[PDB]
Symmetry: D3
Subunit: 273 residues, 6 copies
């Protein structure tokens, strides 16, 4: 018995956004949705109307799916995501990603607020993730495989499309701001990491730590949906500074890089258009 | 739907220990309960009478909650804890810690028998943990958050109160025995670690390995209950010696440090009184 | 309430293979079953007839249990195993191993196709595992303990019998092919590892990475069944080469070492006979 | 947590049948769907596309929802229903009925093949049910009440609208065929009734026995949706004749009254138009 | 695994009502709690504080347990009950009754608003039930038996104590009002009965119909707690009159007999004192 | 997903009773197993060894399956049955009956201790049931149908084979004792019926009341296994006498008819041999 939500959604969306085929799908984490406000002919569907979507329970995540145009590019934007720490398993974002795939999207632009594991990169920086290290228990596709979307086994090689990443770099040069690339390691949460664990993440070879990304991305790769991810650093990981960690700190510190983020995105979109 | 056990307990305890407000809550692991025998006006409530408490299934853990005085300090002492390996999830110790919090406790003194990851520290030593590395799958607060006790997100910074740890040090000098501080990393169990995994724990940066602590502590921090933890080393981790590992070895080797432990605790209590 | 499948099987097997007591139990992973074809007076029982056994859902795994003789040695051979990624928990192979134990087996010869974490060892090589690092969430015995088969706590010291491993070495010299020994680290799957994660496995101290072994082995040790494992390398781990990873690549690349494997096994059996 | 399927469907249907508001909703049981073939501008939606709908598992039930016009009357017709004996509880038809309600329907015309408990009425007869006796265990609304659709408690007085029943009578006179009215008693099934039980149904005061109706009707009344039901007798109840009972007998014997049924319906519709 | 709520409650109650042993336990249904207002030295415990108790969801049921004295008789009074139609099974009232038993109660005085099945007895009448006919699916003790409270099998002979019923009669003569005795048959609800079903209840031999009583009483008999029940008729069953059925009608019509009820109870208590 | 226990058992039984095909299957209720003691070459298999069988929890039911010969007739005899009141649903006896069917049995001889609903028939009498009235909630086949054993819908006409019943009559004449035939109505239990309910059973048209039979028989008919049932009356139903009901009374009163029962059975077997 496999979920059929992705299919339902496709029909439900057609009722609100008829004759529309998006190219890029976006996931806007905490306080990053200020982008969805600039979508042309934007139509908003609440997750409550889309079976399978992550009905929000966290701040900085609304619970809407915005469809429209950005830089003359058809786009499906997710204001708010779903996390592992919500207690619904690594599959929380899957049907959602699977919807993007059916909608016709050709790429997933995954954004998220994170912490830095490199003293060199501080709060307010943007990082284009180039690979990840899962620390959450298990993976999204564990269980019976849904032949409809993907295969039993799949490679995560070049998960974070190297080619699209290259365009991200150009866009960054052009806009006068650094775009460092790093390995993202996922933490289950909902509590923050311990200083001890952060050092362990540094030793393991990580550059950025967050509580999401992984679920979505692995699901995306499984159904063969190209991925691109950019984290908005909001502080140094626990123990690398003197700053106290709070969700309030996260939401606030995501405003320093907000402008560069929108330029990076709107720039990327313009080159791919 | 959130558990209400903590609340039930508070009433249940009032029937056995009326007009009593404890300051320090204790968790006595395997063969460490010999301390609860010196509690003044000690009242004992079986876990079977306290909804949510870890009804024992392991040796060295009775299943009682002792309330009374120690060094003229009101105290609630847990003879026996609950583990992940019992198969009930990372939430096994939560309602319990949450009870301590409601009872009015101002600090959790968590004890546990562990293995050493440093050849320098051997069997019979006591270690004041200063941080930890979770290796168990997931965390205690994963799932809907209980606004009543804590917030969705919380910092583990200074989880093992640095100030209380300092007092622990004085007490140790005063009693003529070393109190080394180390990072505790948790293992799921119930099988012991592999030599290979132990080396991995050394590389990750750990000093002590055990099958508990983490669940309790993270729950404690969530509901804002200061923590203090001391492990009683009972052997070197797998592969760092010639000694064979067994639960029988654990219970037995926890008798070498038993006296120093009681002195350390009874000393700590006297300074905080 | 404990599973009784192991017991049922013993009776069910007696109906197909009467008055037969195997000494060595074998687990043949993907495309490794070509060995079971040389079993003398071979009797085949489908897993569908054996309660608890892993009814296959993966390629390279049939779903049969072959009983007979090999080098004049009574043998119970499992064509096809069960994995964590199937979504049934770390206990998926337990009843099976527990059956071997009851059958009277004196040792488990576990085989499996894996990836190499050492550039020195490449595709087509055989590796005798000498220990492992679990990365899957949790362990097989987590939960109530079945006193019938083992104890609550058990040591994984010398899990991969060092003495049997020594015989494996002789057999390898004698047959003119290398038999390197390494630490096997398990990955949950079903997706393959990320380059980033592989490096992390190298740092953690691993030599071979695969999606099985661990479950079986830990279960084996719990009920006190000596273990021996040999992985057939089918490629370098993700990111250590230019080769693309697929299940098709795995099945195909397990044919280069197939002959040496059979000779190693048939040789081992002859020395223990 | 209440089901939201009814809502989803409304959107899903809008995609296939835009700007359409049905007045009468129909439920076509076994071999009664031959009516849905005469629907003007008929649009067909498979239950597989409508969350909550009874995806068929029984013969004589397709799994489609047909929308269109009949006698110039907007109509939503259910080809195939869901039963208790399927093992999903008395709530199996609820979301479906609740969908009719939201769609805007003003009445439910429930049809079903049944057995007669009166020797006077035989195979091929049509019966307009005037009340029912539930024999299935429990009722559809047992559980938390969904304030959205109805109240905690509701009256089943005049469940089978007496006024609409009167029109049914006229239509019957006009078409030259009897339309006897009777009490329908529900049996759980899936096995047929015992002669003994049938006599018990006669004693209890029943006129027609079937394995459905009840669930739908009670759900209908709860969300305040007027009901009308007509059973197509396909044989005498067990023990009142010499005929053997089978599903094959049911499907076949529903062809004797098929023409009168269509005339009765198409006639009813014309008077209400 | 058996529920331990009854035991917890006993301790929880001791905290609010110390050194108190009730003789009669009362269950006050809809709008019948006006009695609990005359309890001497009344102490009120919310069901939210008593594990196992039916936290209300229905009107006319508060969610409190009142303990005190009535006619100088120690009494434990339940303001509000739990029903089957709530969706929690026939066991919904058990732990509650089991609590009464442990508390030391010697009898259960069960009250409830019902419908009359006899035209002779109308709205406002009181009926002392003398036996019952269960129509709800299953029974409270179905499942593993709790040796602590009762036996696997138990007789319902003289369930409604014939001797106590006799005292009820005297009290009724003495107060100048009739107290007819009748058989109570239970209906699952939450919808009201159909006229058809009511006739069926008359044929089956019932005198009063309601949606409760049965669960409580059978539970009581199981743990050997003498029972006494009195229904307050609030209308004729469906189809025996012209009155419309609603919960509003029930609550309102329970005020005509309210005074006689209190006199009957307060009178009964005085004779047993 | 359908149960495969029946199949497992067939193999498990072959190990204990090789080359044996039974003709009659027997179900011995409470204190009726004294028959299984006269089975020739009797082999006994504990239910603990037969997956799906009702591991006993009730007195008068051992938990064994005896296979052998009786009157030179191959026979599979069930010492002890499973009931609804055990809390495992109406399917509790199914796999068992389904095993009889596969074993090759040509008929089920169902016995059980019951109560009489006719004053004419008293304690110690034997009754050949000729039909039944189910009062338990639901039926055994409710749910997905197992095409392997039966069809979705099946007739209960002549459930209690009329022809075999005729032989039962002869055997009874021949042995000088009455064999009255009656309709058996099932009660859920585990509590006994109320006087009120018994009268209701008389009105409904029943002659014997018990807590079993129904589940087994309906399952038998579904997989097309001819049925024969005989109840051993152990008392009058509640309220038709002065005798108190207890399980102790049941076991004891089943000794008056024990001899006639064995003669009736051993006689029946001889005529069918
Ligand atoms: O896992 C995380 N750790 C952090 O420190 C952080 N900061 C923002 N977002 C974060 N996520
Ligand atoms: O996880 C653990 N590993 C050990 O080696 C040990 N010794 C005591 N307690 C221990 N816990
Ligand atoms: O986890 C795994 N990773 C790999 O790269 C591989 N190759 C074969 N088998 C494998 N298992
Ligand atoms: O419950 C039922 N009993 C019958 O005899 C019958 N015939 C058709 N449909 C039927 N349903
Ligand atoms: O089942 C019930 N039916 C009724 O008609 C009624 N009136 C009050 N209470 C009632 N309960
Ligand atoms: O349901 C039952 N009721 C009885 O009175 C009885 N006596 C024996 N067996 C019985 N079963």
């Amino acid at each position: 018995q496999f979920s059929h939500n992705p299919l339902f959604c496709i029909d439900i969306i057609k009722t609100y956004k008829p004759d529309f085929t998006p190219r890029v799908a976006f996931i806007l984490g905490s306080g990053l949705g200020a982008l969805a406000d600039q979508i042309e002919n934007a139509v908003a569907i609440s997750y409550e109307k889309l079976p399978g979507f992550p009905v929000s329970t966290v701040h900085g995540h609304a619970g809407e799916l915005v469809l429209g145009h950005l830089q003359g590019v058809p786009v499906v934007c997710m204001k708010g995501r779903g996390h592992f720490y919500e207690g619904r398993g690594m599959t929380i974002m899957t049907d959602a990603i699977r919807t993007f795939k059916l909608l016709g999207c050709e790429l997933l632009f995954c954004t998220n607020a994170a912490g830095s594991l490199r003293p060199e990169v501080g709060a307010g920086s943007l990082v284009a993730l180039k690979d990840h290290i899962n620390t959450m228990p298990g993976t999204p596709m564990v269980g019976l495989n849904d032949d409809r979307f993907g295969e039993r086994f799949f490679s995560l090689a070049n998960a974070y499309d190297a080619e699209y990443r290259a365009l991200l770099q150009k866009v960054a040069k052009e806009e006068g701001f650094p775009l460092t690339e790093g390995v993202f390691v996922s933490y289950p949460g909902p509590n923050f990491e311990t200083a001890a664990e952060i050092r362990m993440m540094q030793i393991i070879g990580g550059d950025v730590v967050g509580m999401s990304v992984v679920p979505e991305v692995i699901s995306a790769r499984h159904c063969d949906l190209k991925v691109v991810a950019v984290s908005a650093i909001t502080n140094m990981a626990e123990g690398l500074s003197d700053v106290k960690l709070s969700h309030a700190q996260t939401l606030a510190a995501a405003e320093l890089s907000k402008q560069n983020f929108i330029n990076l995105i709107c720039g990327f979109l313009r080159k791919i258009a």
